[PDB]
Amino acid sequence: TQFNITWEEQLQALSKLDGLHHPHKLEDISVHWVFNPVDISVFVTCATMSSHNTHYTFKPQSSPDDAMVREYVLSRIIADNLKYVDNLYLAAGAVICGNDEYISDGNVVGIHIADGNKLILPVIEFMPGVHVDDISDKLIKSSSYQGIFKTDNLEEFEFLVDKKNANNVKELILAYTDYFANKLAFKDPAEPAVEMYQFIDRTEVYFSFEGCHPDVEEVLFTIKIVRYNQPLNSTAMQVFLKNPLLSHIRTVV
Amino acid sequence: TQFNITWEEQLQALSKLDGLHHPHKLEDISVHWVFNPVDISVFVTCATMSSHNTHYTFKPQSSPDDAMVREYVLSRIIADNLKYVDNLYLAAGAVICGNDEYISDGNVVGIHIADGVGGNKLILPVIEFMPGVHVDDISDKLIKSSSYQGIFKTDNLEEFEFLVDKKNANNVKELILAYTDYFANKLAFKDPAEPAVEMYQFIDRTEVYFSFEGCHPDVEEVLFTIKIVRYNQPLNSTAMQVFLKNPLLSHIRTV
Ligand SMILES: NC(=[NH2+])NCCC[C@H](N)C(=O)O
Ligand SMILES: [K+]
Ligand SMILES: [K+]
């Protein structure tokens, strides 16, 4: 470890978040980092005893040191535990429990399509520590075009996730929007970013948020919602979902 | 601890295999094991520096000890490296290169589905290599979960045309033959072991298991099974062929 982040340091940072009482398991983190002069980026590896090593890459705005990397890793841990804030956790739980076909990882909500282990089409992905502006270039390149998305409108969410889930999903976005605006407020209020991209086969909507936390420069969080072009309600979807091959798709590590 | 298997012991055992020249990377193994008296089984854990951990479960035929577990783990390593025997590796390559839709990943030859997460590949299996496994040890589970059993004849190419259609039938038949000849001629017992062929019919697929038992100087037995799956409709069929190109498949993920 170039340096260590104790679990107590993490818990003290997480304790400044409103409504957080059941964070993820926190262990001492051994942090390694290397600076790359060619592309001006820092590669960070975090190792704990229980979980497997996570890695990050960020672009430094001044010469890298341990203090900057420590602050960056904290911002990722803070963002990672927003999902466990009471009202945010409850808002996601209402989405998942409101649909027997929805099953959750913890970071991905997907439509259950087959049993293996389970097979899913992702529709909601939680992306802590990510903002859409940092990936918009590849999104513009790989998508057909960018569309518009009305932020607070129930009919938009009926389109995205159907009437069965529209209000729950809309409340999930609103819960994150309110939490960042009221509980992670900057002196100069940050506005949420909403960006919609159309692909050959799907619509993707990104909801990105910037939050103020005492111990870091910025807390980033993005929620991605996917709508596949064929309506999940009927037609080709029923032909596709009943094909028995799906229950024999194998995952090779 | 509880005992180690150095890479030299592994390489010495592997060097007795005819036609093996490019084995898998070999490292020292740290082996842990524990006996379970309720179901009379031994659970084994094997750890290396580069690609740990592997796990096994077997049923001991006498009171377990290190020497038995060491022999068992060696038999799994030997079976694992049969895939790299020249004529067996070549016979597998002929199946793989004989179909642009066939891809190989790990012990599975099949149809690519999705690229998943962090190096994972979602694949529809067609041929599965199963080193260290014999069908007689899973047949009870297979009989209960299947509709019925059939009789499969390895002499007949048309039955391989049923399994993997005509584009792959002869390459696949030669793959089975290569393993059949290798075990009979290169891993022979004094009392010859006959290969096991068992076909199982499910509602949605047919699975044919080709199992083999091999004699090796350092272990009681070498086991190897090849599983071939035919699904409800053949691969080159039209109504299927449009299914593997549905764009949804690339977005599939596993929990
Ligand atoms: N059912 C069995 N696997 N019996 C042991 C067979 C041993 C050896 N393969 C032989 O035939 O001589
Ligand atoms: K559910
Ligand atoms: K191929």
Author numbering:
A (entry chain B): 2 to 117, 121 to 257
B (entry chain A): 2 to 256
From the study:
By performing a screen based on affinity purification and mass spectrometry, we observed that a previously uncharacterised phage protein specifically binds to two RNA binding sites within the CTH of RNase E, and by doing so efficiently inhibits the RNA binding and degradation activity of the degradosome assembly. We have determined the structure of this protein (termed Dip, ‘degradosome interacting protein’) by X-ray crystallography and show that it forms an open-clamp like homo-dimeric structure, and binding of Dip to RNA binding regions within RNase E is characterized functionally and structurally. As with the 756–775 binding site, 9S rRNA can be competitively displaced from the 583–636 fragment by Dip, and the addition of a 4-fold excess of Dip is able to completely remove the bound RNA from the RNase E fragment. These results demonstrate that Dip targets both RNA binding sites in the C-terminal half of the RNA degradosome, and consequently blocks the binding of RNA to the RNase E subunit.
The 2.2 Å structure of Dip reveals a clamp like homodimeric structure, with the dimeric architecture presenting a grooved, concave face resembling a partially opened scroll. The dimeric form was confirmed to be the predominant species in solution by analytical ultracentrifugation, while self-interaction was showed during a bacterial two-hybrid analyses (Data not shown). Interestingly, electron density for an unknown small molecule ligand can be seen in this region in the structure of apo-Dip, which we have modelled as a single arginine amino acid. The unique structure of this protein resembles a partially opened scroll or a clamp, and it is tempting to imagine that the two protomers of Dip could act as pincers to capture a binding partner at the dimer interface. However, through a combination of structural, biochemical and bioinformatics analyses we can conclude that the binding site for RNase E is actually on the outer surfaces of the Dip dimer, and not within the “clamp”. Since one dimer of Dip possesses two binding sites on its surface, several possible RNase E binding models can be envisaged.
